[PDB]
Amino acid sequence: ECITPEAIFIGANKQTQVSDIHKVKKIVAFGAGKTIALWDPIEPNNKGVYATLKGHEAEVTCVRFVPDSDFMVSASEDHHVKIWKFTDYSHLQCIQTIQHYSKTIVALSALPSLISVGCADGTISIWRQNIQNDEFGLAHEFTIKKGFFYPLCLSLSKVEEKKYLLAIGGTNVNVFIASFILSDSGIEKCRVVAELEGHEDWVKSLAFRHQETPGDYLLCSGSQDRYIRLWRIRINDLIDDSEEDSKKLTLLSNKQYKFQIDDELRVGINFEALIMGHDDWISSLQWHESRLQLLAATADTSLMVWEPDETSGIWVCSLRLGEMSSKGASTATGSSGGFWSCLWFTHERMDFFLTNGKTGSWRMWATKDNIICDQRLGISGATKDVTDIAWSPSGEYLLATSLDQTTRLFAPWIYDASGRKREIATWHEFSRPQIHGYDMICVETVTDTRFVSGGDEKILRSFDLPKGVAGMLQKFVGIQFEEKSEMPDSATVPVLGLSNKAGEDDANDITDPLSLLECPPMEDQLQRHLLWPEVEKLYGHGFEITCLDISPDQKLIASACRSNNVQNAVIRIFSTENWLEIKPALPFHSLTITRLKFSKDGKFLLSVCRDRKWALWERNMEDNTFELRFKNEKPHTRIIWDADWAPLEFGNVFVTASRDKTVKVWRHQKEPADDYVLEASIKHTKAVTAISIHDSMIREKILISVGLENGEIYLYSYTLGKFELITQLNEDITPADKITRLRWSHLKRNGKLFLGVGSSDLSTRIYSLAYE
Amino acid sequence: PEKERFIQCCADITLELTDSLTSGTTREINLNGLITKYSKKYKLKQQPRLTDIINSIPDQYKKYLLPKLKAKPVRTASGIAVVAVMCKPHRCPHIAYTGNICVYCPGGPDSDFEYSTQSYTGYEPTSMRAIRARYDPYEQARGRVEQLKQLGHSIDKVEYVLMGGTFMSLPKEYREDFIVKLHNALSGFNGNDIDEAILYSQQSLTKCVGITIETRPDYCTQTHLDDMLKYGCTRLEIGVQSLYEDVARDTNRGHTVRSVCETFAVSKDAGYKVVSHMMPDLPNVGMERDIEQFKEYFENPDFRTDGLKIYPTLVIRGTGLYELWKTGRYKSYSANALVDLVARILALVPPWTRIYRVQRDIPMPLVTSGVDNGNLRELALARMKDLGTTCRDVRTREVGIQEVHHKVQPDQVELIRRDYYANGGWETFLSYEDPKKDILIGLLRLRKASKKYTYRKEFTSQRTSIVRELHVYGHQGFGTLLMEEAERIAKEEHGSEKISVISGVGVRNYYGKLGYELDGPYMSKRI
């Protein structure tokens, strides 16, 4: 097919084990809202996420790659545990679904043909895969205290050939230890054999270490009390007791738990070490492949690496990262509010650390041996629904927003710092214009440098393009801005008020290739000091602004606010020259104006709302005032969502999309009178939400891209009267949730069409279509 | 250097103090002097604090040596750390169906402030904490609890307050998210489902001993009360501001007093505890009617709420009161007059009603006209002493403030029991108190679920007495005594087969050892 997903930008979730890495073929898969997401962090051309395995219905909590197998388990808040198998070398397809537990699944750890599921009702369910077919059968379920211990983290190990341990942490300061054997059709001899004690608070995460020395290994358990405890598991003939007939005076905290697995594997698990001083909780901890180094990812925006002291046999801080000022979802002051789950994998001589940034963006750290560590590129994406996708004036870059209080400027990576164009264009997050304090809704481009946005408030703010991002884009994407270096400097996040100041006086150059960035910007830079200054806010609306559009003349901006009556369902128009408003209103609607469009010719304004009626207003050339020209009464039965303007070449013709599961194309006519009667109509199976039409004509037919409410995107070719289905996008190349915005890129690079998709599945997609 | 010697000075101070305290020996010169004798070798402005040295103790020694500096019961022993958070700014519900907003609420979403929630001015410490957290509950809660931890408190019972406008007028998904986020920032669980969040927070360390949700009388219907009891709410705060219907009418209040009284009855019969707001110096009131309404408030057996909040009317720029104060239509009281009025009002507060607060802490440089100082209760108590009468408020008779302000210790504890009728129900008020010195050591409210107003499926099935509130401040087997006497009362005095206590989700385990089983959102026990 000629349609390929060029870029995907999804934000990671916030759970404690959202992510896990396939080791034998390093591939990081992490949950993101309703879906999972794949990622290669070591691609030669630096691509981020490329496929979102849909199928769940709620937030994906835990994802675990079944070691030494082509399986990965995922757990959803909708009480579903799914098993996924590699079909492609770099893709997976759901094979098995487990619906049970009547509750959320919290902890989920897997071993070859042996997975463990912790249900928040308080149950631990061990599942063993059937020998004959790739399918898991419920092996054994058991509970602890039945009303007091609910699980929080799980991890199990293969102590012997057919014997298995299970360490459960939960709402208890005692780590429970169960052991069992595998009978090739089920498990038996299973019960809680030990309760390791020494913690004082909840046990957040725990993880066994690889048995590189048979008979003994190490198990770490990190608590909420900022402590880590290392326990020494010693199998028989290596238990190494203390001769008790001569009194050695052992302490009670050094009690050794001995138990029989079946009757004969005497295990003598003993506490080994106390790791001190994490300054906050231990959100995620994980061993190393070979070396005896322990990675602790904490909730104090910090991540560090311990190792045994070569001198005293104790543990010290080998490495520490995250000291660059930030606070996860905030950045003004750090201290409790940073790092979620962590992955730790080594390429040739490169210890990559990968970490959730409490903002939907991954963070990389590549270090050579143990000391020199530098940030490599990661990925990003919103954590909440994405609403508006505003293309730059000529498709140069993409402005995105979200219900999460942020807007982000993306662009593809083309020209290296050296100057020569790269091989394949990779899209990266290049600016974060608004770390706002309102539910961002509607953003639209004014020009190459100016852009106007409105979140959840009665006002809407215009921003200029700052020097930093503009120069850096000209370095990387090679954008030509007439060299007009009168643009204001890079801004900051205001420590007072909310209007984005210039940031000239405070920032705590970079555009130059000799600066610290040879690649798209880094997360610290991006969220702290790569903002955009604000020009002006435009009062006038009463309620929260809902829909916004800009006229091609770059003079008048049309805006509406959410309402429930006629006196608030009016539309305002603002003059860009003085940032003030128009004197009258254009009141016909009674409900909230959903989509509002300015025609290719700046004389016709299209409005549509929940009244299921559309309207078209003329414009006075002389006075820049509008008046009613056309209106409709029952163009649809249910609500209408979005209306779009066809290119002027195809004529004065527009289109509406409505929850009748239908779409109607209206072209102007003059036979009995002047109006745009319904020239065409299509009906789908699911409610249609967004529709986008390419500005450019192709072979006497316009390209209309329609988006459904379950995510399935259709591409259509429309001649006069008849609509030709170009294609529909398969389940692999569509978001899993309602589509909120579709916008055809005005640019056409290397003979391809770019389509910007923004869905309610916390994801913005860029699609490439081949049409020469 | 400038500051390094300060860090190493704190370090040696910590190590030496730990070494001294291991065998049980105190310091000599209040370490700051010893700190300086070493760190101010050049006297380069190095000024330590008690918090500074506390943030130096190692974990194993910190958790065991920290409370050996503080001894006030409610401060670190009772440990009900009032941790206030705020919701996103929004417009209060009545504005839609009346035409304009309350005529005295400063700030909001469409005032001169673009950032502060309704009825807030964006200058209180809570507002700066909310904005520096961007109104996100997770950051708010984590930051506040961490600041409390840093300042050396050994907090273990966080009590949440949800200030700001009417929290109950938000889309249900948003409120569910807010409450789950609060409980998650407390316990550490990272889920999203309210049921699981509650179940996890119940076992949690740093118990959520309750949560207060200030609201409006209209938005406290049966379904709303069910919602807030799902959340974990334990005390309600209701705006009243006046018993005279004309004042409520002229203030664009939007809810009749009869509605307030009905809401009081149904909420107190839902097991809650209500604290009401009572504004003096409202327009068209005058001192005579001010005293009249405050004297009726405790005399009408219909309101008689357990808490109170006296908020003298402060006019601030931008409100609906500035366009009425500027014209001179309304003139405020006098400083001496208002102090006297507060004195006389406080003289009438019955022993059970607790005065949670007095005049708002809105900054002086912003108030156009109203209360001058910020220490109104100080002058009120001085004038009370001058007049001879004395205060019976719970907060003015509880042990904790006495041990640090009055410096008086309790030695004549005795059992006292009030028995009044409020909101159509029979409410007992048990306490262990000091009759000679009027010092309240422990208290416990109790209510006979009235047939007229109760609605919970847990209560209408069989006769029930609700332990609406149990509080012990300053051996120490009091909760046990009060609970046993309440059991005796509910078995004989009330004739109730099942007695159930409403409880913050954090403390639900404490009643477990008392033999209570969890029924719905209450900790119940049959008899």
Ligand SMILES: C[C@H]1O[C@@H](n2cnc3c(N)ncnc32)[C@H](O)[C@@H]1O
């Ligand atoms: C938060 C509590 O304070 C009341 N309130 C409203 N406006 C003011 C003001 N200007 N000063 C003091 N209290 C006020 C609210 O009405 C509620 O009763």
Ligand code: SF4
């Ligand atoms: S009077 Fe009540 S409803 Fe009106 S703004 Fe104040 S708190 Fe909100």
